[PDB]
Symmetry: none
Subunit: 203 residues, 2 copies
Amino acid sequence: FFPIEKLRNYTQMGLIRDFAKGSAVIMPGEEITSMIFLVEGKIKLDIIFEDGSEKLLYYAGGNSLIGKLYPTGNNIYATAMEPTRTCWFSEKSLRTVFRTDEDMIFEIFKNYLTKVAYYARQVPTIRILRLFYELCSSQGKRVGDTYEITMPLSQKSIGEITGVHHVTVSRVLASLKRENILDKKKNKIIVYNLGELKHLSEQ
Amino acid sequence: NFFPIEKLRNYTQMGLIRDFAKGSAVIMPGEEITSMIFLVEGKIKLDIIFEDGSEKLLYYAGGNSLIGKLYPTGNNIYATAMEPTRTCWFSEKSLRTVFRTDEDMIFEIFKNYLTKVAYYARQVPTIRILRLFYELCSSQGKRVGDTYEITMPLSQKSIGEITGVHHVTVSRVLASLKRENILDKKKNKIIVYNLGELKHLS
């Protein structure tokens, strides 16, 4: 959420806007010039790329600060997941805030430094499947009605090879295990359903 | 993308000037930074050492880029000048002085970070190919004199599908591994001549 709690002390200088569940906080194509402080509730923020596709950007919760003051070239469609109270801060109202409390300039800076640092630090599932299939058909040994690949292939290495975030890699492997397709142990990979693994990798 | 903020050049008299020669460290790892760093002239490479000791690129700062920080972020940073570079270090106190003179600069800086967060959220290579060969060689490879042999097919097309690396890049990585006598793929046989150089490159 990247909470900025101190901002609650200054909502009287912004404009309070309440949104019912499901109602749009930010309309598609809408032009936002205010920062949006989430005082209570939850908001889903999808992004809209130019072809027309729609992808979840991030959620926002209590004390989150979203919105913007100037154009960015990202089209945002934001939706209230529950009754939600917001406070909108134009550039003018932020000047008023800052003139009352200089430290609020740095509270907002810290928030955005922290945000940038997270995303930078973080900086497809089909690729993991392709890797396992390649490994199996090439290096897999038949042991009963399973294939075994002898290889210490850590979750981290899989991520570094396929260009996939560590969290998605854990998800994929848990899913492959849950569906009785493949079990990835420490020293071994055991393929239970080569047919389904292969099919899945050709997506 | 350097995300430049040209307007800070009008206020470098309020921070501390610092020049770095090619190779110099701008930020030592574990070194506590409490200053915004304004790259007025040059180019800087930012890496990030993870808690596991591993290192990967972060970003490249350039003319009018604004890096550094006033407070902890949780990112252990190691930065180095890639050419002669002039910077200006802004402490929190120097920023207050700036803002007291020109309130508008607050919003110049804020507009800069709004653009960066837009960039990164929207988003959210050669090394991938090297890491693949290395993992394959260390687990599948059989030592033959001063070499290692791995018996398995592995098309350039497959390598691209597995790593997500553009085929032209794969084309070029394989060509150069071969030229440099590090690794050659002969039909369905992979020969590693220089595993050490392979491990260091990955």
